[PDB]
Amino acid sequence: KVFGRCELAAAMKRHGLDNYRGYSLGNWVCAAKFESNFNTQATNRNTDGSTDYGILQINSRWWCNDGRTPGSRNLCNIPCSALLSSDITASVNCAKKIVSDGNGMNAWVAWRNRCKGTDVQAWIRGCRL
Incomplete structure (x- = not known):
């Protein structure tokens, strides 16, 4: 599934990502975009x-x-295929574990390089939330 911007914002909010560990919703939408x-x-x-x-x-x-990464740790305890579903539940639940690790959203290269320190509120502007 290819989400719309506001459609994804609404799904991420329902799943509790808005201000999760202090990261506002625009940060999560920006990360997903890039x-x-x-x-x-x-x-x-x-x-x-x-x-x-x-x-x-x-x-x-x-x-x-994913059965082909020797020495995988599988810390979210899921098959990687579950993360490709149109239902983003598994991706969100795993992302919550990742962002609670020491480096926060710096774990996502695209967030660090394209979203951090920008006007991330723009990614949810206009959306009915």
Whole structure:
């Protein structure tokens, strides 16, 4: 599924991401835009052999099991395929575990480089929330 901007904002708010660990909703929408272009089916392979999955590009070396990343830790206890669903529940629940780790949203490269320190409120402006 390719989400609309406000449609995704509304889903993320329902699932409790607005101000989760202090990150306002615009931060999460911005991250999703630049990680996946709002596409739940996005995948990207890394040089170390791991793969990033879904709307928030969660990585198979630490967070989910895809059966082909030796030494995966599967800290979210899910198959990586579950992160490609049109239902973003599993991605949100796993993202909550990731952002509670020491580095916050700096774990997402696209957030650090394209959203941090910008006007992220713009990503939810106009939306009925």
